[PDB]
Design a protein around this ligand. Structure first.
Ligand SMILES: Nc1ncnc2c1ncn2[C@@H]1O[C@H](COP(=O)(O)OP(=O)(O)OP(=O)(O)O)[C@@H](O)[C@H]1O
Ligand SMILES: [Mg+2]
Lengths: 240, 40, 232, 239, 240, 250, 105, 209
């Protein structure tokens, strides 16, 4: 199964595999963290938890939600140091689209430019391929909302419901049973079906201080982060 | 496979309870042995 | 920073380039794909299964156009494919900015395969893990070409790449002849992808693109259900 | 830019890549050269003909100028690029200082090219040795050789290649003053020397004489057949 | 083994040991704590007297990056003042290009990306330093950030780096830094670094304090001598 | 970084070097090409390898590449490395013609390429080319010529040479049947079909399994002609007619 | 051409029409050719019981071995079970006519 | 100690037969391939009882043939991997130059891959003389044809000098392979003498395949 330095750098195994990338997918799981993204009929919701262990730490600086452009937000999983460097690229690549081409970048064209950069790390035998993931949401005209995931292998696809992190497989088994009964999805239902995803996978039944919710909607396409007061509005309406 | 056929040709004459092997048992037997030639 | 500047692909004592041999094993573990030319145009067909119902199948595409009249599919790994697509998009443009003429399909394969050979010898890189199938109708006669991660290329009448390709090529040998129409080639290209698919082959499990003298185009999922109907 | 030290010291003070290259010289074909007082004579052995090839493309005696010939041993791929760099230098000397190149000057160019090349980054050393033979201005015939480490070194008679220790041990018991008496008598030293080597019975030898004013002159295999007859004829009667 | 030589190779369970080995070099440096008060930040460094031959005021582990930004380090001192040079140089290019004093959420972002860039390649090693940044602005209040050798930064109400890290931030949360001004803090910074490092391991040590806020008019400077003598008057009352 | 380097350039302690000898081991298998000349004309006989029943058989040849207006080459070995060398010496001949306004002599085209091929064996830390190849051509200084290249970088002129899988079997038979300067370009064609009858283990000599191209001198043309698959099989059976007579009468 | 499965049908259909038009030994030959053809298809899912019936027809058309000819119509009916009610109900006729022909009433 | 090295088929094993012809000492022979075993520790036990037998007889000669084969080939019958081959070689490294009183035992070793094995075993003190065998020269090849065609009824059709430079580097083993196989072609036709076309189809059969 192994021959040469194929365990160490990004070259091929005799079986056709290559191990340094599939060693890096389970570097995401060392954060101990899970994020869920759900697309609706006219909106898109990212929900993720935050784990603040100390009272000495400032709770306003542990946000994994990031504002890429004025209409595009993202959530980051994986290790923290590589995740924040990748946000710096996406803020930079979006500004060059507007300067070169004169209009707002589509969210799938941004995810293509990120995956092409991440492809090069698993392409040269010198660099380390950035063990962190990437989930974007946004509103595109004549397409509605749409959600994209980019992994450190360079792969990407558009989803309808998305999980990433430690409890990824249990959450996608939850969401695929939720979506195939084909219920219509309003704004409040997508928020309810995204909180109850990780509230039943992790089995927490939390208070409004541990999670954080970003959202975009086709009536206000700004990426906005919900207040703890209005998270509590959705949270007490979830317990009927 | 020649003995693979000719020994198996007796089974066709036995599964219809004959006591003589006929010339249509062999051509029934070739199509089964060469089928496993077409299997992997 | 800088690079490595040494080849990590060397000759074995048995005289075999081992990394190119291992890269072909990644090609053989890819999705199956067939391609047939028949006397007026070329049919490319691939096999696209999402892992779950959550994926949006109308987001990414296997079958890609290169120009007005050249399409291209693959059978290998995903992110290596999108690199040499964008490279091949540009190479058709530097030919056009010089000669003011669409590039012939033979000359495109001259230049895509020369990238992959240059990429399997230079310093500090592993070779690509895809094979290609390239179609097009230049000067009436259609064409069908196939490259490999080594950098060679061939001129096929009909072939198959991916899983069970040794069973696909035996199936095409007993079915293909010299005289077929384009829509007859479509029906025998879905019939050979049915040899290795899952239980249900719907309008979104496959993806078919065709060439004519009118140029390359990709089939919408409406008429793909019509060809998938009255099949087998 | 491939930056890596190829030639490094050993823990007992040797350069392994240099002395590994000296074994590539030790299985190339034998080249012998002596000098007379008026005509020099050098000639390779072991032509190893296969009677289906062009005889001129396999030559190992080439000329750098009118006055300077050159023979070599080792591997022929690295040889003919050292020659083509030496032809450029001996030509650019004429654009400078007007006299033609002395035979000592061109060996200092080759040896200094060969030394610093065992010093650079990412370069294996050359695997050839040479014999540079020339009669310079004021008619002084002399020869030199070049170790693959780059030590130019003059001689009266020498021999490199496969089977060089036996031939050099043969010349020390044979190089007298009267052996270089006549021009046809110095050639009888070389043909007796290469016959005392890998066999080469008149079919694998190729001498090339130079009479201090001509260019190189390869004799065809008729006088070598004439010389090998009389070289054996004197040995036929004395013993 | 063999998976822990370069910083370009993941482990077969997906983590980089060259970063984790470089983190272990931080717990041989002594102790550097810093907490922020209501209206300023107070640093504090306890400093080992290695021998009698050194001079009082040598080899300061407490730098001065900009006019208002301060730095306290703990790690391998040659790498510490190397990071202090580029952070001092980064703040100069902000003012020369954008005209005004650099904010801390941007300053610690630019330095941490420079630290992160040495955990990707085989040609360089990771830094062996962890450090803290603190400042005060009249339009922003006080800030307090901290950077590990991996490149992860957060905000804090008080942090600690050195040998006894948990044993130091145990007593920090006993304080009430939300309301105290930066005068009573200076006595309480010095007290919690007296109960640490028993006289068995070290013979004698040296207090070194720092100080920023509007009481210092926004400028960063050292405490005066008389104030830290009050804290050393407040030394031997922890024996009750 | 120095742990992953493979050192494709250094010597071996026995004096030789391993990396091109592995490439000259790979040049042994995978292909068969041969050439012959004694008079007006020179031919390249190559044996096709992929003989699968689904191919288009286009691009005018498979292993024959026209280099100049009056010379061509046959290639063997790694085919991907072959395409880069071919369009490298193809414009060496043109930059000669741009500089001197005269077609290039056939010998110093070979020496120009074999200096490029030699440099990868000597520095750079680079995989060499696993390609050996023949050269036919014409020039006004020596007429019809025939050359052979090696992956080490040394060349040579010849009269008959094969680089096949049983090349050593062919060369031992070429120097049993020849004549210096009298084999015209019909006896050479007759001798070519006899040699690859032997070295090809696939018997009966299918006319689609081989390729033959000739280079004949017409006054200002130097016609390089890849002869079609309608006159191969009559030359195949012409070998087959005489061999039944020569065996039975002995 | 490419197909193998449809060759089973037209050989079985000719096996219907030489016996119905009263030519037994040629119907024996075309039935035998469909035996040796259907021995190579991986899925005869329903065509086996269609072939299992007329394997018993022609073997009972000469009245040589009623017991083995009974065994064909048994398997011809087990294939027809709960998927083809027109062909299943006629299959009871050929097994019980043979059983009366077996003289076990 | 004496070691014999060279290209394959030049007469390394052949010279050791001539020593076994001449000598009066007891002669012990073991292939290097059969030193490796399947159980742990059984390998070094076999070396300790080999030199036990050699010492307990007489003045004696121990001949070890193909000792590169202990290191080149890996076999899955051996439970210990390369770090059991090594412990076998450490025991052999003892028995040549141990501190025990050795006695009168001579050791002859032979291989063709001399660069592969351990230089700690080839140091002076364990092996003194190092003997290289070259490929046969074209006047010594003619001597070999004289030897292997001595007692055969050689018809006068043949010329041995054409057979010499057939292969440029044919070994001494190649010559006997041609001479025996040409005799086998005679017995297909019940002849008693060997003609020229026997040797013509001999080298096609022996060399070129
Ligand atoms: N110089 C020679 N003189 C006479 N016979 C020779 C000579 N060389 C080889 N032979 C013949 O070749 C045969 C094999 O020789 P031998 O096996 O001793 O060579 P080797 O080098 O020991 O082979 P290996 O390398 O396989 O151990 C012998 O039977 C011998 O008859
Ligand atoms: Mg032997």
């Amino acid at each position: 199964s192994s021959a040469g330095f194929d365990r160490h750098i990004t070259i091929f195994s005799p079986e056709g595999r290559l191990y340094q990338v599939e060693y890096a997918f389970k570097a995401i799981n060392q954060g101990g963290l899970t994020s869920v993204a759900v697309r609706g009929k006219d909106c898109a919701v990212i929900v993720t938890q935050k784990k603040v262990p100390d009272k000495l730490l400032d709770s306003s600086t542990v946000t994994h939600l990031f504002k890429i452009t004025e209409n595009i937000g993202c959530v980051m999983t994986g290790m923290t140091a590589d995740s924040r460097s990748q946000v710096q690229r996406a803020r930079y690549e979006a500004a060059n689209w507007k300067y070169k081409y004169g209009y707002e970048i589509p969210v799938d064209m941004l995810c293509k430019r990120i995956a092409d950069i991440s492809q090069v790390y698993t392409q040269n035998a010198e660099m380390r391929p950035l063990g962190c993931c990437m989930i974007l949401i946004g509103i595109d005209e004549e397409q509605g909302p749409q959600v994209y995931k980019c992994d450190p292998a360079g792969y990407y696809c558009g989803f309808k419901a998305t999980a990433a992190g430690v409890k990824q497989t249990e959450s996608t088994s939850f969401l695929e049973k939720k979506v195939k009964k084909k219920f219509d999805w309003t704004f409040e239902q997508t928020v309810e079906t995204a909180i109850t995803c990780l509230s039943t996978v992790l089995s927490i039944d939390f208070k409004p201080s541990e999670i954080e919710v970003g959202v975009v909607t086709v009536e206000n396409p700004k990426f906005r982060i919900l207040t703890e007061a209005e998270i509590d509005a959705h949270l007490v309406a979830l317990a009927e | 496979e020649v003995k693979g056929v000719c020994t198996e040709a007796g089974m066709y004459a036995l599964r219809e309870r004959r006591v003589h092997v006929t010339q249509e048992d062999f051509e029934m037997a070739v199509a089964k042995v060469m089928q496993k030639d077409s299997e992997k | 920073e800088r690079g490595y500047s040494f080849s990590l692909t060397t000759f074995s004592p048995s005289g075999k380039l081992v990394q190119i041999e291992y890269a072909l094993a990644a090609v053989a573990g890819g999705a199956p794909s067939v391609g047939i030319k028949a006397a007026n145009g070329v049919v490319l067909a691939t096999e696209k299964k999402q892992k779950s119902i959550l994926y949006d199948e109308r987001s990414v595409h296997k079958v890609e156009p290169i120009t007005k009249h050249i399409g291209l599919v693959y059978s290998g790994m995903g992110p290596d494919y999108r690199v040499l697509v964008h490279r091949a998009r540009k190479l058709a443009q530097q030919y056009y900015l010089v000669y003011q003429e669409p590039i012939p399909t033979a000359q495109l394969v001259q230049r895509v395969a020369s990238v992959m050979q240059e990429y399997t010898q230079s310093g500090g890189v592993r070779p690509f893990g895809v094979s290609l199938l390239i179609c097009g109708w230049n000067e009436g006669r259609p064409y069908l070409f196939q490259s490999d991660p080594s950098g060679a290329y061939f001129a096929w009448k009909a072939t198959a790449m991916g899983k069970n390709y040794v069973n696909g090529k035996t199936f095409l040998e007993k079915r293909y002849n010299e005289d077929l129409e384009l829509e007859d080639a479509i029906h025998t290209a879905i019939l050979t992808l049915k040899e290795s698919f899952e239980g249900q082959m719907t309008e979104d499990n496959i993806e078919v693109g065709i060439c004519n003298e009118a140029g390359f185009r990709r089939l919408t999922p409406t008429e793909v259900k019509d060809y998938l109907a009255a099949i087998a | 830019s491939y930056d890596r030290a190829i030639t490094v010291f050993s823990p007992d003070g040797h350069l392994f890549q240099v002395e590994y290259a000296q074994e590539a010289v030790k299985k190339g074909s034998t080249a012998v050269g002596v000098r007379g007082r008026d005509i020099v004579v050098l000639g390779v052995e072991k032509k190893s003909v296969a009677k289906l090839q062009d005889e001129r493309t396999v030559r190992k005696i080439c000329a750098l100028d009118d006055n300077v010939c050159m023979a070599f041993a080792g591997l022929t791929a690295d040889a003919r690029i050292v020659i083509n760099r030496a032809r450029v230098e001996c030509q650019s000397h004429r654009l400078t200082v007007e006299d033609p190149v002395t035979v000592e000057y061109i060996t200092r160019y080759i040896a200094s090219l060969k030394q610093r090349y065992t010093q650079s980054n990412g370069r294996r050393p050359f695997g050839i040795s040479a014999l540079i033979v020339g009669f310079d201005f004021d008619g002084t015939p002399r020869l030199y050789q070049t170790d693959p480490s780059g030590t130019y070194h003059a001689w009266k008679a020498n021999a490199i290649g496969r089977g060089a220790k036996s031939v050099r041990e043969f010349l020390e018991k044979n190089y007298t003053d009267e052996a270089i008496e006549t021009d046809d008598l110095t050639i009888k030293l070389v043909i007796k020397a290469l016959l005392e080597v890998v066999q080469s019975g008149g079919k694998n030898i190729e001498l090339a004489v130079m009479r201090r004013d001509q260019s190189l002159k390869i004799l065809n295999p008729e006088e070598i057949e004439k010389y090998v007859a009389e070289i054996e004829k004197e040995k036929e009667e004395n013993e | 083994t063999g998976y822990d030589l370069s910083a370009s190779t993941f482990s077969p369970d997906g983590r980089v040991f060259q970063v984790e080995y470089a983190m272990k070099a931080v717990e041989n440096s002594s102790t550097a704590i810093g907490i922020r008060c209501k209206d300023g930040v107070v640093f504090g460094v306890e400093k080992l007297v290695l021998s009698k031959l050194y001079e009082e005021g040598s080899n300061k582990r407490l730098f001065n990056v900009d006019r208002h930004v301060g730095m306290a380090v703990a790690g391998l001192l040659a790498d510490a003042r190397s990071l202090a040079d580029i952070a001092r140089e980064e703040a100069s290019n902000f003012r020369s290009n954008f005209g005004y004093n650099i904010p801390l959420k941007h300053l610690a972002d630019r330095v941490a990306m420079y630290v992160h860039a040495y955990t990707l390649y085989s040609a360089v090693r990771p830094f062996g330093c962890s450090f803290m940044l603190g400042s005060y602005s009249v339009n922003d209040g006080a800030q307090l950030y901290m950077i590990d050798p991996s490149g992860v930064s957060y905000g804090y109400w008080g942090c600690a780096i050195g040998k006894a890290r948990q044993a130091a931030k145990t007593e920090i949360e006993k304080l009430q830094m939300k309301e105290m001004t930066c005068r009573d803090i200076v006595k309480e910074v010095a007290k919690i670094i007296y109960i640490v490092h028993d006289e068995v391991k070290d013979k004698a040590f040296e207090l070194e304090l720092s100080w920023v806020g509007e009481l210092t008019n926004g400028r960063h400077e050292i405490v005066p001598k008389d104030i830290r003598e009050e804290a050393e008057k407040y030394a031997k009352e922890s024996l009750k | 970084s120095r742990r992953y380097d493979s050192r494709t350039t250094i010597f071996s302690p026995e004096g030789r070097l391993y990396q091109v000898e592995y490439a000259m081991e790979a040049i042994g298998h995978a292909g068969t090409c041969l050439g012959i000349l004694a008079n007006d004309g020179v031919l390249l006989a190559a044996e096709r390898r992929n003989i699968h029943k689904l191919l288009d058989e286009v691009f005018f040849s498979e292993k024959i590449y026209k280099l100049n207006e009056d010379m061509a080459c046959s290639v063997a070995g790694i085919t991907s490395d072959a395409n880069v060398l071919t369009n490298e010496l193809r414009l060496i001949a043109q930059r000669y013609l741009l500089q001197y306004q005269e077609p290039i002599p056939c010998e110093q085209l070979v020496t120009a390429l074999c200096d490029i091929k030699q440099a990868y064996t000597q520095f750079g830390g680079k995989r060499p080319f696993g390609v050996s190849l023949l050269y036919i051509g014409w020039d006004k200084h020596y007429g019809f010529q025939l050359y052979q290249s090696d992956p080490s970088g040394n060349y040579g002129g010849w009269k008959a040479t094969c680089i096949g899988n049983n090349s050593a079997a062919a060369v031992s038979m070429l120097k049993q049947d020849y004549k210096e300067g009298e084999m015209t370009l019909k006896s050479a064609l007759a001798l070519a079909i006899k040699v690859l009858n032997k070295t090809m283990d696939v018997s009966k000599l299918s006319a689609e399994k081989v390729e033959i191209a000739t280079l004949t001198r017409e006054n200002g043309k130097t016609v390089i002609r890849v002869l079609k698959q309608k006159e191969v099989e009559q030359l195949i059976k012409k070998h087959e007619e005489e061999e039944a007579k020569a065996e039975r009468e002995k | 051409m490419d197909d193998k499965a449809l060759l089973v049908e037209v050989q079985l259909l000719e096996s219907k029409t030489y016996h119905a038009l009263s030519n037994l030994p040629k119907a024996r030959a075309a039935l035998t050719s469909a035996r040796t053809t259907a021995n190579a298809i991986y899925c005869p899912p329903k065509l086996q019981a269609t072939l299992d019936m007329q394997s018993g027809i022609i073997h009972a058309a000469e009245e040589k071995d009623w017991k083995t000819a009974y065994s064909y119509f048994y398997e011809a009916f087990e294939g027809y079970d709960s998927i083809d009610s027109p062909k299943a109900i006629t299959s009871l006729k050929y097994m019980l006519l043979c059983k009366i022909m077996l003289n076990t009433p | 100690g004496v070691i014999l090295y060279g290209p394959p088929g030049t007469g390394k094993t052949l010279l050791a037969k001539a020593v076994a012809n001449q000598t009066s000492a007891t002669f012990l022979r073991v292939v290097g391939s059969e030193l490796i075993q399947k159980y742990l520790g059984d390998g070094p036990k076999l070396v300790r009882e080999l030199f036990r037998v050699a010492e307990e007889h007489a003045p004696s000669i121990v001949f070890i043939d193909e000792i590169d084969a202990i290191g080149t080939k890996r076999y899955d019958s051996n439970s210990g991997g390369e770090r059991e081959i090594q412990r076998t070689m450490l025991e052999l490294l003892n028995q040549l130059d141990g501190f025990d009183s050795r006695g009168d035992v001579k050791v002859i070793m032979a291989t063709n891959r001399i660069e592969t094995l351990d230089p700690a075993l080839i140091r002076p003190g364990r092996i003194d003389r190092k003997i290289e065998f070259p490929l046969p020269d074209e006047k010594t090849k003619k001597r070999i044809f004289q030897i292997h065609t001595s007692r055969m009824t050689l018809a006068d059709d043949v010329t041995l000098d054409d057979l010499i430079m057939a292969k440029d580097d044919l070994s001494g083993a190649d010559i006997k392979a041609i001479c025996t196989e040409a005799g086998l072609m005679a017995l297909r036709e019940r002849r008693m003498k060997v003609t020229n076309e026997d040797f013509k189809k001999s080298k096609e059969n022996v060399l070129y395949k």
